[PDB]
Description:
The complex is a heterotrimer of chains A (about 425), B (about 210) and C (about 210).
Chain A: H1 3-18, H2 22-34, H3 47-58, H4 61-74, H5 78-99, H6 116-119, H7 127-161, H8 168-182, H9 184-213, H10 218-227, H11 239-255, H12 263-266, H13 274-281, H14 283-305, H15 317-327, H16 331-362, H17 367-383, H18 389-410, H19 412-425
Chain B: E1 3-7, E2 10-12, E3 18-25, E4 33-39, E5 46-51, E6 56-58, E7 66-71, E8 76-81, E9 90-97, E10 108-112, E11 121-125, E12 136-146, E13 152-155, E14 164-166, E15 170-171, E16 176-185, E17 195-200, E18 205-210
Parallel strand pairs in B: 2-10
Antiparallel strand pairs in B: 1-3, 3-8, 4-5, 4-9, 5-6, 7-8, 9-10, 11-12, 12-16, 13-17, 14-16, 15-16, 17-18
Chain C: E1 4-7, E2 10-14, E3 19-25, E4 33-38, E5 45-49, E6 53-54, E7 62-66, E8 71-75, E9 84-90, E10 102-107, E11 114-118, H1 122-126, E12 129-139, E13 145-150, E14 153-155, E15 159-163, E16 173-182, H2 183-186, E17 191-197, E18 205-210
Parallel strand pairs in C: 2-10
Antiparallel strand pairs in C: 1-3, 3-8, 4-5, 4-9, 5-6, 7-8, 9-10, 11-12, 12-16, 13-14, 13-17, 15-16, 17-18
PDB class: membrane protein
Keywords: membrane protein
Assembly: trimeric
Amino acid sequence: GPYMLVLLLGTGIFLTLRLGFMQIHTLPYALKLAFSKHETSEGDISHFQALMTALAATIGTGNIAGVATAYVLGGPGAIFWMWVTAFFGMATKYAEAVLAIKYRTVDDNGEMAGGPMYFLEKGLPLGKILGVAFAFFGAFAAFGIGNMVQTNSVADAVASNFGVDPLITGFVLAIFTAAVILGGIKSIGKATGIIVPFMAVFYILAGLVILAMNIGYIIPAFGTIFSSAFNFSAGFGALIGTAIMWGVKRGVFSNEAGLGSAPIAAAAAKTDHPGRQALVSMTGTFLDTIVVCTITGLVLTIAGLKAFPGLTDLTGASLTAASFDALMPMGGLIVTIGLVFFAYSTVLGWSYYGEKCFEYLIGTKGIRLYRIAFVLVAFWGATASLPLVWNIADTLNGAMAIPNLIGLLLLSGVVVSETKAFNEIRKN
Amino acid sequence: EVKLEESGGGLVQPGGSMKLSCAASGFTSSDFAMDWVRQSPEAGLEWVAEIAASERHYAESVKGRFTISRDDSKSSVYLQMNSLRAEDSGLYYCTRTAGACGQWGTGTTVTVSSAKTTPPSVYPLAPGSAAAAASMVTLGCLVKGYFPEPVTVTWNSGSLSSGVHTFPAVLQSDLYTLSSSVTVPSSTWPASTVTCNVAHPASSTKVDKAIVPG
Amino acid sequence: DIAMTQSPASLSASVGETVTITCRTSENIASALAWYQQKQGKSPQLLVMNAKTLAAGVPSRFSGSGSGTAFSLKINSLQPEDFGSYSCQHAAGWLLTFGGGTKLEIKRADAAPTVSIFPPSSEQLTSGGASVVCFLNNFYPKDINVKWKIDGSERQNGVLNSWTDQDSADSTYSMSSTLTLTKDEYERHNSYTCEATHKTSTSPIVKSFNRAE
């Protein structure tokens, strides 16, 4: 059950201790390298194009609506525990990308295939059993968080606000999905490279616009978040179920910490060493949770700090859009616009995430099947009725989570050695 | 403020069908997800259906026999029922959902029974000849043999509102029976006329009985 | 399915006291439990949301607490306006379930019934039937026994009893006991009697009439 979350967060605590709080010092260099200009050494696409591919998958409706779901049920204090999910989760994502160095390219051009299902093959053979298990789960799990959750949320959210959108929104999402992922990951890095920054800057500015117009409410909005999350007034640590569980559960969903489905893209990077790309991948959490998610959470609390009528019982994506429309002139149109690119980005990314993990099982023979399936399920997901899809999504993600976490625990000795190699190169 | 008015209730035979409606106002039907909650004649309170603007969820008890729909253009929610059972009898309530059911509706009533609509017979209740002639007299009206609910009973066209008791109907084999009691000073009766005003909307019957002593 | 059992199923509170109502559930449900109050001819009224959080416009006397496997709705200084049924609901999932309900009634000083008995109408007899009606009005408490004696011999079955909701004004109950017979069976006997046994008196209240008048 939910014990996996204590396991997932536990690795974050563990690796941070074993890696000695690496994330705080390496972050600026990693950030500069991630967006640095000019490198071609055995890879499918750039370091930057790898990050934007991963961020495309990492940024999704969980950033828009998944936070709202946590804000309502877990209270505003869930944001702080979403932060804890990312900060300690940085160490997890780094270990994921480092161990992605034990990757072998596949036939049918370089394409390259790296991921936790491969680590386990290079573990201490049982690993062959864990890796094929990981691929079995992830091949399915991509349809949940990566396809159906994102494609349904936009379809319905567009129907509420613009309403001339039955399946039409599903059709356009499928066509634009096939066009990009037709040209494999090389096409993705092109599309995800242009889309993601335009997407993130569009949003983030509107949030900083909202913060600008309501400067005074900023620090109290932080206050209610910190006052909550540590509000033991009710129950002996019974906020575990209220704020902490929803913060962690929805936090892992947005930034994708201990899931083992984040490096799938880092492997395609043109990287000299694991540490070169693994530092760029560690920024996956930071941009999602501490930046994008925090922007969403700040508006939500600010709406709650204000009065505003009728938003008290709003489901999720509609709440945030209403929270934006309340504070900004066209904030409602902004959020629903962002939701389209936020979800579409995540469709393309997790397609590759599922492709390479699928091909582990069947080889490149069925790669054509996975893509056409992903396109069709994207269409069906917008039309079908998936009210509790998030619930079945989180279960698949947890199923994916169990094996990879075991590897990161066991292979901590490998990375800490491999880290002491790269940081030695970092003095030259 | 916010408005939710349900409509469309009625009497329908088992296996039959009908669709309910809930005209909504005072807010944005499109942004909020809506529910149908039903209360049986015994204060059951049972959840029936969910909808947001695209996808829907149903209770296992009615899965496949109910269809919840929405029309954000007309700001109304529907609930279509087919292959109805006796257990589907209840007050069907309209509401908006998220974690708690905050804004509820008026309620509309469904009765699922093979019984046949039959108008009431209204008989006057006047005390026996050897009454004790106490300071106050108590008179009555008996409304028996009617289906389906409801009946509305007033005394002297609403002039007599104090000291009246209309008892809840009791159902015995396909028919309802109801009685109502009024108390007035013995000075008034029979000197001043006391009349019983009974109305059964389903049968389009309105009848007045004057209470006369024996 | 989550089964929520409320206790006590019904209670009567002497006005101005404090009372505590419990909603108990099959499995842990975190803080996702909500409370309603419903009155005759009305939809449920939300009192407390998310176990403890307070809904606006509901008086401060209402407070709820608990999480998981223990929930309580607490009313401090009851008032006659609190008469009604109290229901609990949980938000675990989307198939939100409810409790069986708790009926809140009011205590008053005991008062004896005002018994009245009516013979069958002349119209009903010509229609082939005869109903004998006994009215027991404005009495407290609800616990009452009505016995029908026909010609001195008790009649067990054939009686329809109906009770009113507690009176809003004076907190008194009322009931009507109707004994229904065919005309031929009614005309077979002479004396119909209505015996009301209540805690107010050791000796019952007897009202009767004879058909031979």
